[PDB]
Chain A
C-alpha cells in the first residue's frame, strides 16, 4: 500500500525540464526544495531554476522561484538559516538564494576560481549543528571545500579527493553518516565507492570497495532502530540495475538488491523504521521495500503514471511520505501510510547478519 497524496507541478517553471535532486525541509516540516535542470527548448529562461513547495499549506503554486544562471545540479536548504537556500550548479559555482529579499537571483555566488569548483557539484551540503556546521561542496572534479555561510569568496577548508594513486575521484552524491563523524561516504562515478575523512592527515579517501560495475547514482546512511543498533549501514545505487548494502568494514558485502527493467537512480531510507529503502527506475516505478519483512522483493511498491524516469526521491524527514523527482519536470508525492515504524524492529538486524554469514 502506497498513499498517493497530492502532487506538485507548475507549467510556469517545469516546462519540459528535468527534476534534479531534492530535499525536504531540514529545519521546517514538510516544505521541500526541488532543484531542476535547464530546458534547451527555452533558451531565454534561466538554466537552473530551483523551486520549493509547501505540503503543510495545502496549495499548488511553487511557493518560491529561484534561478541562477547555469543549471542547478544540486540544491537543498540551509542548516539554521530559515531564509536561505544553498545550491550547486553545472558550471561549478555555488549559489545562495534568499527568500525575504525577493531577488530571483542568488545573492552570494561562489567564484569560478581554481580555489572554488569549476565542475558541477552534485552534492553540496551543510554538516553539523549551530556551531558544528559548515558547507561542504564536492564537485565532480574531485575537490571538497568547506565554506561558511557568511564568507563564500574563499573556501574555509578545502582539499582534493584522490585515492592512493593520484587519479581523480569523480564523485556523485556523497553523504555524511549519522552524527557527522566526518567519514562521509562518496558515490564515485562507477564503483570504487569510498569512505572519506575530513580531519587529520588521513583525511580524504580511506578505502575502495567495489560490488557493482554500473556507474553510481546515489548513496545514503541512516540512524538507530530505537536505540538498538549502531546503524552505520549505507546503501548505494548504480546503473547496473542493482542496489548493494554496504558496511564500514566490508568490501564486497551484503546482497546487491537488483530491480530489473529499470535503471536505478537513487536510494534514501528514512531512519524512522530502520529499513525502508526506496529505489527508482527509468520506467516509472517506485519499488521501495523493507529488508526485515521481505528479502528480495518490493514490499509496498507502486509504479508511476506514464513512464517518467524517476530521477530522485526523498523520504519526508522525521515522518513518512515520499518526494518523487522525474526525468520530466513534475513532482509526485506518495506516502507509505500503512508502513508505520515497527517498534523493536531488530528483525532486520538479525536478518542482515544471517545473510552476512554466507
Chain B
C-alpha cells in the first residue's frame, strides 16, 4: 500500500540519518583497529591469533555494515539508493567496504609465513638450545625451539574452519608435522620453566 510510504518518505530523512549515525560509528570502531581495540585482549584471551582476531573482527563489522545496508534495502526497496541522502549512504558503505578488507591480511600472512616461516616450521631437531641473556652478569638459560609455530598451527586451523582459502598446502603439511611433535615440546617447556623457578 503506497499510503504508508507517505510517512515513510517523511521519516526517510530520520531513518537514513540515523543509519548514517550508526555506520559512521562503525567507521570510528574500525579506525580504532584490532591491535588497539579491546578485541585484541579478549581475542587473545580466548586464544585467537592476531591474524584471526583481526580478520574475524573485520568480517563481523562487514556483516554489521551490510546488515545496516539490508535495513536500508528494506526502507525503500530501490529508491533508497538514489535517495536524497542514500546516495551518500552508498558512498559511506563503499569506502567502508574498502576499509574492511582482509585479503591484504591473508596475503601478508601467507607472505610472512612464506618469507621466513619456511624454515620456522620443522624446527624440532635441535630440541635443546643454550642461550645468552645480556643482563647483570649476562646469564644464559635453556630454550626449546617452538615459540611462534604453535600459534601458526592455530592460525591455519582458524583460516580453514573459519573461511577456508586455497591455504598453502606445504604450510599445512608442515603444520601437521609440527602438531605431531608439539605436546612433547609443551611438556618439555613447562619442565624447563618449573626447573628455572625452583
Q: Give residues in A with beta carbon < 8 Å to B.
A: 18, 20, 37, 69-70, 90-93, 112-114, 118, 120, 122, 140, 167-168, 170, 172, 189-190, 213-215, 217, 239-241, 260-261, 263, 265, 282-283, 307, 309, 311, 327
Contacts and interface: CB of A to CB of B under 8 A. Distances in A.
A69 B161 contact: no
Given A112-B183, A112-B187, A118-B187, A240 B162 contact: no
A95 to B, nearest CB: 12
A36 to B, nearest CB: 11
Contacts of A170: 157, 161
B45 A37 contact: yes
Interface in B5-34: 22, 25
B60 A168 contact: no
A69 B190 contact: yes
Q: Describe B's contact surface by its main secondary structure.
A: helix
Contacts of B193: 69
B38 interface: yes
Interface string B163-198: 000000000000000000011001100100110010
5 contacts: A69-B194, A241-B60, A263-B38, A263-B42, A309-B42
Given A114-B183, A189-B161, A311-B45, A240 B60 contact: yes
Contacts of A168: 157
Contacts of B161: 167, 170, 189-190
Interface string B112-156: 000000000000000000000000000000000000000000000
B157 A217 contact: no
Given A215-B56, A240-B63, A91 B190 contact: yes
A327 B193 CA distance: 26
Contacts of B186: 91-92, 112, 118
A167 B45 CA distance: 24
Given A69-B197, A170-B157, A241-B64, A282 B39 contact: yes
